[PDB]
Design a protein around this nucleic acid. Structure first.
Ligand SMILES: [Mg+2]
Ligand SMILES: [Mg+2]
Ligand SMILES: [Mg+2]
Ligand SMILES: [Mg+2]
Ligand SMILES: [Mg+2]
Ligand SMILES: [Mg+2]
Ligand SMILES: [Mg+2]
Ligand SMILES: [Mg+2]
Ligand SMILES: [Mg+2]
Ligand SMILES: [Mg+2]
Ligand SMILES: [Mg+2]
Ligand SMILES: [Mg+2]
Ligand SMILES: [Mg+2]
Ligand SMILES: [Mg+2]
Ligand SMILES: [Mg+2]
Ligand SMILES: [Mg+2]
Length: 148
RNA sequence: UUGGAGAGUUUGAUCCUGGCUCAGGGUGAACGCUGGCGGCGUGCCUAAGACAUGCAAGUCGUGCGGGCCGCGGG
């Protein structure tokens, strides 16, 4: 099975005659603390169903992060819309230096040592995907020679 | 490569822009409430305004000639 963290659970609403009607949205990261993470965002008429749906999509969307002593191989910068995430290799003592959103992702991914920074829009959702696509572009010394 | 966390607040809700705000470290500090001990620091940031009183630069008789006192004695 997988380890699971709720990053964001927010209420939205829409208007109608007679009043606002709500809906809930569930940002969930899911991982094995050993190189496999998934991000899922899920909506439903109620809180828990949404969390459940969220967790579901998460598994249906994964990425294999190439750890190396608990740190990523190389520097990576990624922009998703106006959001930017910076990922930077750190040595053993460092810890994970990051805000909650990319923290939850990197920890449950088994990253244990990394320097990060959020730039631009720090909307959680967008920072979330931006951290994902970031990880998803990581390449290994091998990966590269093999390509070239 | 010893190194990099962010949050609140514009909307019915969203994304973005954008300012305000906060958490951190610092000080010749000051103010309040409170206050036992020791060590190293450290203390007129304002009127280079004004200052009573003592003290902060003198020494050599192995450069010189004198007075005053005394010690030694003709
Ligand atoms: Mg790979
Ligand atoms: Mg963005
Ligand atoms: Mg851009
Ligand atoms: Mg390295
Ligand atoms: Mg914000
Ligand atoms: Mg308001
Ligand atoms: Mg407006
Ligand atoms: Mg409101
Ligand atoms: Mg802001
Ligand atoms: Mg006091
Ligand atoms: Mg007192
Ligand atoms: Mg002065
Ligand atoms: Mg005056
Ligand atoms: Mg005066
Ligand atoms: Mg004296
Ligand atoms: Mg002489």
């Amino acid at each position: 099975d997988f380890e699971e963290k709720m990053i964001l659970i927010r209420r939205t609403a829409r208007m109608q005659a007679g009043g606002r009607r709500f809906r809930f949205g569930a940002l969930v990261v899911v991982g094995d603390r050993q190189g496999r993470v998934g991000l899922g965002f899920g909506k439903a008429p109620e809180v828990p169903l949404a969390v459940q749906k969220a967790g579901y999509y998460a598994r249906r969307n994964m990425v294999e992060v190439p750890l190396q002593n608990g740190t990523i191989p190389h520097e990576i910068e990624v922009e998703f819309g106006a959001s930017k995430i910076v990922l930077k290799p750190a040595a053993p003592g460092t810890g994970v230096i990051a805000g909650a959103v990319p923290r939850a992702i990197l920890e449950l991914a088994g990253v244990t040592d990394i320097l990060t920074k959020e730039l631009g829009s720090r909307n959680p959702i967008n920072i979330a995907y931006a951290t994902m696509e970031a990880l998803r572009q990581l390449r290994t010394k091998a990966d590269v020679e093999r390509l070239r």
